[PDB]
């Protein structure tokens, strides 16, 4: 896979079902201890979804962070909204094994917030059937996604009116064969710094990705930084 | 070690706290610094409402983890 076949396979994906972008504050640690160990216990990364016309915010606080463009095609082991919190996996366990298990099956805090309704503590939210969190009357907008495909449609109602999300939350294994871009911010030139960095560590381990600015629910090319 | 209590007023209540410490414990610290009597407190940590008597360790809650205060 070249340069230009991994932008094609991105900005299709992006305009169909969407996919992921992963923003780091240390691309170097997320080189060599997340992305090198892939190829010769970071199991689950944290990623946004993104989509064209999904005005999807990215976390970036200081505006300064790259990050990596990950395939739609990476395993999933949950997504949520609002990003309800997940526990780290516990010695003992198989992280492999770890989500979606206990990836939480609604967001408590967030349909707390939004009903007021006390029975909610009543539960476990990772341990919870689709007929219980009827019974609660836990909204939708608060119950987690596990296929890939269906996160458009938890997205839909945002999409459609045009308005600003803050950013998602999934959790995924992602395989160096996912990786199909660095992410770039056009108005920070210590994105852009980092970004050359990570494109030459990655470049010399025969992974030459394209530069993608990624924006509003609009993602372009980057000739270079 | 140190974890983290938010609250829906926008406040973060730091503790320092050992893993072998109680519900009952945390709450009782939250009362210490913030006068909130315990049977008022529930504590969520993950999407469920933490049980006093057991650890912090037996829900896993390690070092700078992030609890939810609400109040009953
Ligand atoms: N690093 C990320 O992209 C990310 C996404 C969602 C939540 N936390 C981190």
Redesign the interface.
Known sequence: SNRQEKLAQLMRQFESGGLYLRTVSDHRDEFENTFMPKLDERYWSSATFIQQGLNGKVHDPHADRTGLIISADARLGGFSTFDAATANVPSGLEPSQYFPGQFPKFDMMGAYQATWNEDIFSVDATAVSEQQMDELGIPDEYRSVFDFDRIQEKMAQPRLAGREVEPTAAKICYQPKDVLGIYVDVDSPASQSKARELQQAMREQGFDLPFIAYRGGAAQELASV | MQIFVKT?TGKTITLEVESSDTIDNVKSKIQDKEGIPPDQQ?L??????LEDGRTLSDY?I?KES?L?L?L?
Not at chain 2, 44 to 49: L, N, P
């Open positions: 829906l529930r969520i940590f993950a999407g469920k409402q896993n390690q992030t939810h609400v009953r």
